[PDB]
Amino acid sequence: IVGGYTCGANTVPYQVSLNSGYHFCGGSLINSQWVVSAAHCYKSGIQVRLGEDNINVVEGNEQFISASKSIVHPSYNSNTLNNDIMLIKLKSAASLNSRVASISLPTSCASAGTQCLISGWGNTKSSGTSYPDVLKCLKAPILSDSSCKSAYPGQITSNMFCAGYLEGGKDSCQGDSGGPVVCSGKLQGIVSWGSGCAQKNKPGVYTKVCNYVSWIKQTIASN
């Protein structure tokens, strides 16, 4: 997250870190056994880390649980990033408490101008790299369809939206992928892609979770 702020420990209790001997992506806890992340984050050897603040220090309140299933959307396209969503089933259920909690799925889509909270342990620089110890947060609005298509002509599908700031300086970045975009208590987006980070006229692009609620529910029910 570039241009954000230190969340505070466990203030985003649905945020998870996906770890393969290092933090590689984010995710969102949607019930005690399932996490939503990005398809482009898929790999073998995923350990889900819940209750994290400093990802480099054991502070208390962490739960580390192996992924038992990692289910990429069958129509995920790695060239366009259409359908950039994955479900992870935990090997054992997480223990839910004030610091480890699920986030609700949307019942309807969010409109342009809706304010959201985007979070992660990704890069904090727009040029070069710096990776934080603690979780970072950014408040950002959903942009209009027209503004999103103007920024990324030919690249925005119906399963994507843009959020952030056209003036530069405030965005998600590498290492934030898979993490949450929460608006009014609902998981409306997944950190997906963008051109650079925090560059003028190049906002973040997010998977539009409301389009997938039935697919999530059906996939969880059958697994």
Partner: peptide
Amino acid sequence: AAPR
């Protein structure tokens, strides 16, 4: 454009 790059994945994040």
